[PDB]
Amino acid sequence: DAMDITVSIPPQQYFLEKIGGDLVRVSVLVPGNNDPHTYEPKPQQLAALSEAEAYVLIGLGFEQPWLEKLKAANANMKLIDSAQGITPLEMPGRLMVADPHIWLSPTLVKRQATTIAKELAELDPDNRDQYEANLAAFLAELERLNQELGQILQPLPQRKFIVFHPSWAYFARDYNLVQIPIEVEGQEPSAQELKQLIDTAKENNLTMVFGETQFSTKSSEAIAAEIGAGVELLDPLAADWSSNLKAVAQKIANANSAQP
Numbered sequence: 001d002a003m004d005i006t007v008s009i010p011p012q013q014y015f016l017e018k019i020g021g022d023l024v025r026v027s028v029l030v031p032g033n034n035d036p037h038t039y040e041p042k043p044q045q046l047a048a049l050s051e052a053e054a055y056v057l058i059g060l061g062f063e064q065p066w067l068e069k070l071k072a073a074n075a076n077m078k079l080i081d082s083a084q085g086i087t088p089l090e091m092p093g094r095l096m097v098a099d100p101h102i103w104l105s106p107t108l109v110k111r112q113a114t115t116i117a118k119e120l121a122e123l124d125p126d127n128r129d130q131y132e133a134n135l136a137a138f139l140a141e142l143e144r145l146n147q148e149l150g151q152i153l154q155p156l157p158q159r160k161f162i163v164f165h166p167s168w169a170y171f172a173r174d175y176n177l178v179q180i181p182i183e184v185e186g187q188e189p190s191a192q193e194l195k196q197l198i199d200t201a202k203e204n205n206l207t208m209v210f211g212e213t214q215f216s217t218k219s220s221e222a223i224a225a226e227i228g229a230g231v232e233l234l235d236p237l238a239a240d241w242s243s244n245l246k247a248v249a250q251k252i253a254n255a256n257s258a259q260p
């Protein structure tokens with residue numbers, strides 16, 4: 001019957017569905033409207049883990065906060081580090097911690113899905129073919145999306161974009177963009193740092209402040225007001241992954257192109 005796999009975030013469900021089809025029944029630990037960095041799994045969720053045949057970790061220390069509770073919920077549960085074999089980027093803040101947001105890189109997702117499929121075929125060999133097949137289809141979908149995002153951003157005069165939460169480092173890396181984070185987690189306590197950001201923005205004529213759906217937009221609205229730019233939201237946990245990245249790229253493009 002359908003194999004019960006659990007994942008940390010909505011985007012992973014997208015990948016598991018593409019790879020597993022009706023052979024998997026995916027459960028998500030962190031809701032899309034929540035900040036996974038300060039998320040605490042609920043008791044009902046820990047209880048349900050006893051049925052999970054495996055759990056797909058994002059890796060790179062993303063699940064560290066509840067990593068142990070997971071093993072305690074089920075030691076038999078196979079932990080799938082979907083980030084293995086990938087060279088990570090350093091976090092914007094402290095330059096000695098890996099950046100976990102690799103699920104927003106189409107190219108890197110190819111690797112993530114490949115690790116998932118390989119692992120699903122080990123627990124359920126009979127369907128090894130459907131997994132490898134679904135994987136191939138998905139990969140090709142990825143290269144397509146990758147190429148599509150490239151034609152939207154490549155010609156953009158402006159390569160920098162201001163974000164609240166720094167969750168697009170890997171995405172901005174693939175398409176030669178630079179995210180300027182409003183939030184930090186261990187950098188310089190310079191209370192005026194946000195002022196340097198505003199002046200840099202004004203001089204480069206940045207026209208938009210991209211806040212994240214999972215966080216308050218207060219500080220982004222203020223920043224934007226001061227820079228004279230607009231405020232838009234990007235949803236890094238959107239379940240509708242593929243279509244979401246395209247909308248994102250499109251917003252970037254509308255903001256980083258010669259303006260009216």
Ligand SMILES: [Zn+2]
Pocket residue numbers: 037101165166167
């Ligand atoms: Zn994040």
